[PDB]
Paper text:
In this study, we characterized a thermostable endochitinase (Chi23) that can hydrolyze both crystalline and colloidal chitin. Chi23, from a marine bacterium [name] DSM6057, is a member of the subfamily B of the [name] family. The catalytic domains (CaD) of [name] chitinases adopt the classical (β/α)8 TIM-barrel fold with a conserved catalytic DxDxE motif.
The crystal of Chi23 belongs to the P121 space group with four molecules loosely packed per asymmetric unit. Chi23 comprises 14 α-helices and 10 β-sheets. The catalytic 113DxDxE117 motif is located in the loop between β6 and α5, and a hydrogen bond is formed between the catalytic residues Asp115 and Glu117. For Chi23, it only has such an α-helix, and lacks the β-sheets for the formation of a β-hairpin subdomain. Therefore, different from other bacterial chitinases from the [name] subfamily B, Chi23 does not have a β-hairpin subdomain. A detailed structural analysis of Chi23 showed that the side chain of Asp229 forms four hydrogen bonds with the solvent-exposed residues Thr226 and Ser264, and that the side chain of Gln261 is hydrogen bonded to residues Ser10 and Asn9 lining on the substrate cleft surface.
Numbering used by the authors: 2 to 278
Write the structure that this text describes.
Amino acid sequence: SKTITYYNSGAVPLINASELPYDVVNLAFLSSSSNNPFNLVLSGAIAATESSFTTNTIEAIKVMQHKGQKVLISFGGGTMGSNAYRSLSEDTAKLADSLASFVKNNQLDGVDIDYEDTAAFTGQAGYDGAQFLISLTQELRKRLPSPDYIISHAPQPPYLEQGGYMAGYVEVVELVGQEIDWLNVQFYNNPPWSANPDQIVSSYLNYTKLPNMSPEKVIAGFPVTQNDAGSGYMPVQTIINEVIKPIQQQSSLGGIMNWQFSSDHNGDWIKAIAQSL
């Protein structure tokens, strides 16, 4: 199983992650400028400017990588507009080249596609979101081959519900799941999954059985603290004993993701979770 975290807030120095039991750190975020959607800009504690990492970030990445940890840039995030994606969907190869260049020029291990434009799975966004994610994944994987590079996505549970109205990622995994390393499923901000372990477990198992998916390719994601999500916080003892152990009893568990690194005091959360894996 793998342990994954997102780094957006800088309240805890990034280099602290190099001494904690994380396998993957997603730097959040790279996203479209309001100006021109094909110009990608950085946000969060990683950014010295819109186009550059801070000095401390650059060093922390090297130290993490020396430890055998993988560091991805997360593209997207919750604040990226559907209108920017609509434009990008008309030239995914150009977007892929920009992302691949950012990964290579900053010596990263790949990309996390944190895509949250739900309306593009319901016919309300003026572009086909599933075909966008399918094409973007193919073009990115062309430029960032396995197994040297990682491509993850971060879907929300409705995206993966067979037969659902917003199940865009069912189509995604059916067409290009073999090219995706794993899914960081956000079991938060999404009723009725939020803080509902029984529903999280049954859905997790269903997702591992989608075409091209497996336990290894599905990571269960949670907020560290109450302030990390509008809904879905659960104490770590509940995650362990009502999510992790029930999944381990029936299948295997690809891993645990959290939002977000700087909310975890002294790394206690990841230490307890890791232990349980």
